[PDB]
From a paper:
The eukaryotic primase is a heterodimer of catalytic and regulatory subunits that is associated with the catalytic subunit of Pol α and its accessory B subunit in a constitutive heterotetrameric assembly, the Pol α/primase complex. In contrast, the Pol α/primase complex produces longer, composite RNA-DNA primers that result from the concerted enzymatic activities of primase and Pol α. We have determined crystal structures of the catalytic core (349–1258; 910 amino acids) of yeast Pol α in unliganded form (apo), bound to an RNA primer/DNA template duplex (binary complex) and in a productive complex with RNA primer/DNA template and incoming dGTP (ternary complex). The catalytic region of Pol α adopts the universal ‘right-hand' DNA polymerase fold consisting of a palm domain harboring the active site, a fingers domain that interacts with the incoming nucleotide and a thumb domain that grips the primer-template duplex.
Further insight as to the possible structural basis for a termination mechanism can be obtained by comparing the structures of isolated and actively copying Pol α, which reveals a striking difference in the position of the thumb domain. In order to adopt the conformation observed in ternary complex, the thumb domain of Pol α must rotate inwards by about 20°, a large conformational rearrangement compared for instance with the limited movement of the thumb domain observed in structures of isolated and copying RB69 Pol. In comparison, the structure of the isolated polymerase displays considerable conformational fluctuations, indicative of large-scale conformational changes and local loss of secondary structure that affect in particular the N-amino terminal region and the thumb domain.
Residue numbers in the entry: 349 to 675, 680 to 815, 848 to 1055, 1063 to 1175, 1186 to 1228
The structure:
Amino acid sequence: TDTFQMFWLDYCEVNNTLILFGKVKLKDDNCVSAMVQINGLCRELFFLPREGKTPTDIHEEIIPLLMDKYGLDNIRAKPQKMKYSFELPDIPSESDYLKVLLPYQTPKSSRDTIPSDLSSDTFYHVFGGNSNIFESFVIQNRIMGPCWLDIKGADFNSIRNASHCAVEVSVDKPQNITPTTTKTMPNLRCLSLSIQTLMNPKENKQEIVSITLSAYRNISLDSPIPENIKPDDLCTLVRPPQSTSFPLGLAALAKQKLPGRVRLFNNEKAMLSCFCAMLKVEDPDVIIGHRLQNVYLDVLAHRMHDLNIPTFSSIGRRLRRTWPEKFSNMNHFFISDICSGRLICDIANEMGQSLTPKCQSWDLSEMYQVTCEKEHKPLDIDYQNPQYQNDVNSMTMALQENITNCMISAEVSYRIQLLTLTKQLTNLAGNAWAQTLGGTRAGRNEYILLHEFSRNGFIVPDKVFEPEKGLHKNYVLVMDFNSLYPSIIQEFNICFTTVDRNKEDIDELPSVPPSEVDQGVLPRLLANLVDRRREVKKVMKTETDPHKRVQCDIRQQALKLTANSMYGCLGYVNSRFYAKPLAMLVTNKGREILMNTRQLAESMNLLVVYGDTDSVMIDTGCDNYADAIKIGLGFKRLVNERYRLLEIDIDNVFKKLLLHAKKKYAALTVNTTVLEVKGLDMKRREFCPLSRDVSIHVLNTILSDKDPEEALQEVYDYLEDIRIKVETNNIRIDKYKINMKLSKDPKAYPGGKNMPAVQVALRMRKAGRVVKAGSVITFVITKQALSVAERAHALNEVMIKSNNLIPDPQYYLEKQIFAPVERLLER
C-alpha cells in the first residue's frame, strides 16, 4: 500500500548495477512491464586469519589499503564466525573471519577483483572476491526465484530512457527489496516466433526470409492452460528471397488463404525494422519457439547486426543504441544478455528435451505427434528454389508452413507445461528463471546449495548390466531407479559436513559417518524435498477440484526432479560443489545396491534384461498385463523392504521387446497396446515407401500374439508375395520412390557419377530443364552393363508407361528389402 510492488522475471548487469525486469499492476488491474535498477550492492568477502592473528589485525591492514585502491571514504567490516566444509585443504571447520562489504560500484578500479590467494601475514585466504552481482543480491536478500517483491524508497524520477518497459524505478540499496509470500502471479504475455531462413553460398550467411508472430496476451500459470488456445493476434512478415519484388497477386492470395495478417516488405532490413517495432509494442514477457537458443536467435541477432537495425535491443527489455564491442565462440553470452527481460521458452533445448523423453530427434513435427498426438507432415522449404520468387502459390504454401510451425511450437510448449514446471524448479532452486529455461541442471544444483549453506552460516565455494539382446516374449518392465543416489545420500548421511575426506588427495576413498554424527545439510535438504512431496501427494488423494489437483501434480514433479538432480552437485566434475571422494562413496553404494537388486530379482525367479543407475529392466515371466504389474509391485515392495528409502516405480510396460540396447529397440508398449521403435533408422530417406512398409509389417508380425513358426512363416509368405509382385512389376511406382536434396549445383558435385540423384539431374540439364541447389530429386532405380546411378530415372518419367521404364527387382529386393530386414530379423 505504501511500497512499490513488482513480480520479477529476469535480470541483467550493467555498470556494476543489477536490473530486475518484471510486471506491475495498474489501477485497472492490468499488468505492464517494469524494471528496477538496484544500486548499493556489495560483495561479502571473508578473510581467514592465520593461527596467531585475529580479525581485528586484518581490519587494520587491508581496510586502509582497500579504501585507497577503490577510493572509498569508508568500508563496512566486522568479525563473523563462519563454517567451511568444502574441498580447500588447510581451512578449518569453523573460524572467525573478517566480513568485508565491498561495493560493486567504486570510484576506482571497480572492475578489479580481489584474488583468493592475496599475499598477507594476517590472513591466507579470501572468499567471495569474485562474487556475481545477481548471485549476491539473490543470496543476501533470500530471493527464491520469480516472485512478488516489496520495494521501498523507489525513485520514480531517476531513470530516463533506459528500457522498453512501461515503468522505470531505482533503489539506492538492495535492503530496500524484500520478497512477499503471495503465491499467485500475474498473467504473462507470450509471443511465439517462427523464422524461415535462406542459405547464402557466397558469404555462408543465414539470412531471414520470413517471420511469424503469434501473440497470447493472458497466459496464466495459476490455472491450467486451455488446450488449443487461440492467439489474440497472428502476423507474418516476409521479404522476397531472390529479387526486390514479389510475384503478382500475393497480397490478395494471402488475404484469401492465410490466417492472420501478412505484411510484405521490399527487403530484409525493412522487415527486421518492423519486427523490432512490433516486439516493442507487444512487450512480451516470454518468447516461445523451436530451436531458438542454438539456431534462430543467433541468426536473428547477426542479421540485425549485419543490416544495422537501430532498434535491435527491443528483442530484450534494456535499451541499447550500440552492440557489444566484441560482437567468436562467446556470441551466446552477448545474445543471452541482449535478450534479458524476455524469457526464452525453447521447447527443443536441453530443458525442453528433458520433459519429452519419448522423443528422439525433437523435430517440430515429431514433438507435435508425441506431446499432442496430432500429425503434421513437414514441408521442406528451400528459398534457393526459384519457384518462390515467381510462383505465388508456392510462396503462400511456404508462409502457411511457417504459420503452422509457429502455432505448433506454442501449443507444444503449453502442453508439456514448460513454463510452469521451470518456474517451480526455479522457486525450489532459488536461481533465475532464464537460467532454468536455457541452462543445464548444474545451475539449479548450484543455487539450491548456495541458498541452503549460506542460510546456515556456511561459507560457500567461489565460482551396469549388459542388455540381453533378442526378442523377449514375456512382459518386460522398466523400473525407474532415478531416486537411487538421492536415497543413498540420505540413508547414509553423506554430506560435505559429515564425511571426513583427504582434501590433499581426492582419489582416496572416504567412509560413511557413524550413526552418532548428526544429519548433514545435504541429507537434511533431500529429506525435506521428499517429505514435501508426500505432503502434496496426500493432498491430491483428497483434492476434488481439478485445477488445484493439476497444480499439485506440477509441484509434485518439480520436487521429484529437484531431488533426483542433487547428485550432480557433488558428481559433476565442473560443479561448484564437486567432491570426488563423495561421488565415489555414492557410486560404490550404487553398485552394491544394483548388484543386490539383481539377486533380489532372481530370488523372485525374475531375469534382469538390462540395468543401470537410472533404470532396471526385468522380465516378469508373464504373458498377461495384470500378472505383470503384480510382479512389478512385488519387486517394488521387495526392493523397498531391503532399502526403506529406495522407492522404485514401473516406468514402461513392454508386451513384447526386441532389444539391442537401452535406446535401440522395438517393442509393444502399454498405456491400449502400441508399437514403439527407438534408435533404429526406420524413417530413413535412403529407403523407399515399399521398404518402409515391409519393415513395419515384418515387425508387427514378429511382435504379434502368435507362435514363432506360424508367424515367421507369415513373414516368408509375405516376402515371397512381395518378391513376385516386384518381379512382375505389379506395385505402384510411387512405392519405389527415393528422395535426395541437392545442397549445390549438380555440376558442382565431385563424384556425381556415383550419386543417382546427381545423374538424374544432369540428365534433365542436358535435355533442357533447369535444376539448381535446393531441388529435391525423386527417382527410381530402373531395370536395364549400366551402373545403379546411370539406371536411376526421375519418378514422373518412370510413371509414364510408354517410356518403357520398370523398377529394377535386383536393387530393390536386395538393397531396399533384404538388407533392412536382415538387420531387423536376426534373432
